[PDB]
Structure 1
Amino acid sequence: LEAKKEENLADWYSQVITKSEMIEYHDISGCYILRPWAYAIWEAIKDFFDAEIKKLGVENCYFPMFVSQSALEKEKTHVADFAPEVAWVTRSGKTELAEPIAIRPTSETVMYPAYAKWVQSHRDLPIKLNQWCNVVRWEFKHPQPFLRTREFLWQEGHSAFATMEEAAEEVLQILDLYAQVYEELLAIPVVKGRKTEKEKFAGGDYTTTIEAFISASGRAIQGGTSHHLGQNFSKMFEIVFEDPKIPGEKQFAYQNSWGLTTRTIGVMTMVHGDNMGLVLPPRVACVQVVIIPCGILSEEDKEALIAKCNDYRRRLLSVNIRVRADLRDNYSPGWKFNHWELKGVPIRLEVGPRDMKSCQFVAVRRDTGEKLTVAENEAETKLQAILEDIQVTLFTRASEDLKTHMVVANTMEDFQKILDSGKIVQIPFCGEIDCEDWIKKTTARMGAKSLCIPFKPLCELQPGAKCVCNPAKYYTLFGRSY
């Protein structure tokens, strides 16, 4: 690592994702290779979330990636301002297709016809389907590894209910899981909220969301989305059942949708990354402890030193710690120290010849850099403890960081001043789409958009407070954003 995250952020991010062997660049703009080090993180997220949504009775499936032209255009499913982001297959070989086919940017236009056919009575609900898949969006904003990629991996759930009550409970549940992904797995604090009228999904009833902060940018980022669609989509797609006991009334399903993507890993990179490279939260690190042999001596002695490392590897596996023994002959220990530091492994387990005679080892934590001499017998207890402290340390630093950088303002005067200090701001807001668009352009004279209306703002709106606009309806979190 040569750039420094506080001075050039773009270079520092580029250098940490590549030198950590997370990302390889591709020759299609906005597309990046996910090497095993980064993909393992995604798998951890995947393993957690998936387990959690199965408890809620969701089931995993897979729907076509191809969207016919008439299907995607059939309903008012998305505003006509998304259409330029849609990538069209137009020929196979050099043989032009009779009609062009779209690559899935989201799956409503492909599963909601299937839901319509599956729902023929109250018995057919609820429908709870989820797919892990790739998604393409020909983004016009600046593409960045894992923040905004023209192809990305994600999970979308689409659900269909007989009553609004059940729909509403799942929206908040799913949002809580996303918040758990970010806070307990990646050690990133987030702010739950509801999107404004401007920033909501146009075709739903209301959009909930988690927002994350990246101090080094001063910018927020949407970490996940959970819509309640009401019946706006069931009416479009005719997802209807007819209650026998309520003759003469159609029952349109109440629907939700929700998504989360590999953008998570980018956030983790920019929140916990330091000027020595990646910093993995133990919760998601595929290697929690790397064992490195030091001090190279007889051949039998050398084999004995390797034996001790692999003994440590076996003890640690037995207590469900993910451990790698870097026993490679071809690199020096110093080289391995730097290598696994760039990769961001939580703990390096250092063991030399005079330590195995001494019945001790060295632990170095990636976050603090503090060295520790630990008795050999107390390895499981001490290394488990240290992993739990790194996670709580990483979440604490970022929590204390988010507290610091998110403050309340009631004047656009202060709001403009605080915003330019690289902070995000909860202001009294009139909700109007115009007032939001005035704030956005005035904050450039890099404008400020709305992030979320917090479910639990910092400060309660004093009755009859006016918007910074119209009276204020709710405190709204505003800021510059990714």
Structure 2
Amino acid sequence: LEAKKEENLADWYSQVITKSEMIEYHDISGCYILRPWAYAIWEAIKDFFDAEIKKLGVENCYFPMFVSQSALEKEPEVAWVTRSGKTELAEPIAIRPTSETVMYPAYAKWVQSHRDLPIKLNQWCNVVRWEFKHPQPFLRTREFLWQEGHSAFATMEEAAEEVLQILDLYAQVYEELLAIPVVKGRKTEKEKFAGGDYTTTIEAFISASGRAIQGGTSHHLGQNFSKMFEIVFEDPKIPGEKQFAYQNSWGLTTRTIGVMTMVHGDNMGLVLPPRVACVQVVIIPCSEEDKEALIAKCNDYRRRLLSVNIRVRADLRDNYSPGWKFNHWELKGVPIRLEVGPRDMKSCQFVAVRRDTGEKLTVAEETKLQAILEDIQVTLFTRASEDLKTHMVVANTMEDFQKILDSGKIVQIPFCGEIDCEDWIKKTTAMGAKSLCIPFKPLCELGAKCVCGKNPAKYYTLFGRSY
């Protein structure tokens, strides 16, 4: 790897994602191939989150990719299919940018009584938003994989409960799987989903860019969509009266992998948190009778490790040098390299090198390796945490806000929350700073006025430059 993360972050990022064999470019802008090394991380995320939402009663299903004009405009850079071969469709049809308008008519038909609620459905699928701004692999693409969950309840408080549960699962994905610290909160009036009541969100910070990025989102839709699509049930108490269902929706994408790359990656390449590493430990070999024995010693380690449920690969290819293999698996971010040399074989001991720090370490010919893995995870998280702690500070006045913002940090400011003030904050700080979230647990507690002067502060709000 040539480019340096602190010099030329875009070039560093492209080189990391391709030389780690995560991404390949497609001949259509903003579309990328997810190679197995990237996809396996998505598979790990999927296994965790799918089990967890199943524990909450959510069922998986698959709705059509195509949205009619009427369904879509029953409420915009949607991709329109307008012909098959050379012959025009009777009416153009749209590729889903999200599936509310595909799902909620079906919900309306399935709900007859309050006995039919709640409905909790999730799908793992692809969506398309065909914007013409600059794409970035993983972080912001035209086609992407995600999961979208869509719930409908009889009451408001079970919906609110789910909203917070799903947000906490997203925070778990980032913090426990990817070792990325996030700040939970809710979007401002300006930035919230216009189709919902409130939008909760997890925001992560990428310091090499000094920019924030949304990691996931969980919306309380309230009765907005149920009144739109007539998702109604009869009142269990009052004859002949109908109630509109309360709804949530929530989503999470492969952006995860990009954030994991941006946060933990270094100038040797990818750095994989052991919890999502497709390969946690790579075994590399360093008298011909002796050579055969060495290979057999590696296979011994491999089988043992496989037996202790550690994801492991023995790279015994004859065609490549050990130093080549060292660099290959470092670039890919394998948390531990296990080096087996003849002396050490003879000494019945071995060497383990951790990817995060490079700390080498000799050990006796199972237990240790697992112990190293966990520490690597903790290490990654705590460093990311310190980075966030360094780059997220309080400022009580605009001038202090601006200086700090220009130092490449994100700032919690007292904020009145009006949309006009938020646009003013954007252009005065000019790209300009946007609102990220109103944090659940702000750093310091809030008579204080907004940084606009004209109005009092309603809440500490986190602002920053953002992807």
Q: TM-score, normalised by structure 2?
A: 0.99
- Partners of 2:208 and 2:307 lie apart in 1 by 39
**RMSD of aligned C-alpha atoms?**
0.8
- Partners of 1:304 and 1:113 lie apart in 2 by 66
* CA positional deviation for 1:188: 0.3
* CA positional deviation for 1:318: 1.2
- Partners of 2:449 and 2:114 lie apart in 1 by 47
Counterpart for residue 36 of structure 2: 36
Question: Alignment partner for residue 282 of structure 2, among 286, 290, 312?
Answer: 290
Deviation string, structure 1 residues 239-261 (Cα, Å, up to 9, x no partner): 00103422232111000000000
* CA positional deviation for 1:280: 0.3
Determine whether 1:357 maps to 2:346: yes
* CA positional deviation for 1:71: 0.9
Deviation string, structure 1 residues 27-66 (Cα, Å, up to 9, x no partner): 0100000000000000000010000000000000000001
86-95 or 242-251: bigger deviation: 242-251
SS of the aligned residue for 2:48 comes to helix
Superposition pairs of residues 144-223 of structure 1, within 5 angstroms: 144-223=136-215
* CA positional deviation for 1:354: 1.1
* CA positional deviation for 1:382: 0.3
Counterpart for residue 236 of structure 2: 244
390-399 or 135-144: bigger deviation: 135-144
Counterpart for residue 456 of structure 1: 441
SS of the aligned residue for 2:252 comes to strand
* CA positional deviation for 1:85: 1.9
* CA positional deviation for 1:459: 0.6
Structure 2: 5+ residue stretches without partners:
none
Deviation string, structure 1 residues 179-209 (Cα, Å, up to 9, x no partner): 0000000000000000000000001010000
SS of the aligned residue for 2:102 comes to helix
- Partners of 1:147 and 1:121 lie apart in 2 by 42
Deviation string, structure 1 residues 371-414 (Cα, Å, up to 9, x no partner): 10000xxx611000000000000000000000000000010000
Kindly report structure 1 stretches of 4+ aligned residues shifted beyond 6 Å.
none
- Partners of 1:48 and 1:311 lie apart in 2 by 30
Superposition pairs of residues 9-28 of structure 1, within 5 angstroms: 9-28=9-28
* CA positional deviation for 1:304: 1.3
Superposition pairs of residues 68-83 of structure 1, within 5 angstroms: 68-75=68-75
Deviation string, structure 1 residues 95-140 (Cα, Å, up to 9, x no partner): 1101001001000000000000000111100000000001110123
- Partners of 1:401 and 1:39 lie apart in 2 by 27
* CA positional deviation for 1:176: 0.2
SS of the aligned residue for 1:416 comes to helix
- Identical amino acids, percent of aligned pairs: 100
- Partners of 1:85 and 1:215 lie apart in 2 by 31
Aligned pairs, how many?
A: 465
Counterpart for residue 307 of structure 1: 296
Deviation string, structure 1 residues 421-468 (Cα, Å, up to 9, x no partner): 000000000100000000001110x1000000000000100xx20000
- Partners of 1:89 and 1:234 lie apart in 2 by 28
SS of the aligned residue for 1:422 comes to coil
- Partners of 2:3 and 2:460 lie apart in 1 by 38
- Partners of 1:333 and 1:355 lie apart in 2 by 16
* CA positional deviation for 1:319: 1.1
- Partners of 1:44 and 1:246 lie apart in 2 by 48
* CA positional deviation for 1:353: 1.1
- Partners of 1:353 and 1:107 lie apart in 2 by 58
Structure 1: 5+ residue stretches without partners:
76-83
- Partners of 2:160 and 2:30 lie apart in 1 by 36
SS of the aligned residue for 2:73 comes to helix
Superposition pairs of residues 317-336 of structure 1, within 5 angstroms: 317-336=306-325
Counterpart for residue 376 of structure 2: 390
Deviation string, structure 1 residues 215-259 (Cα, Å, up to 9, x no partner): 000000000010000101101100001034222321110000000
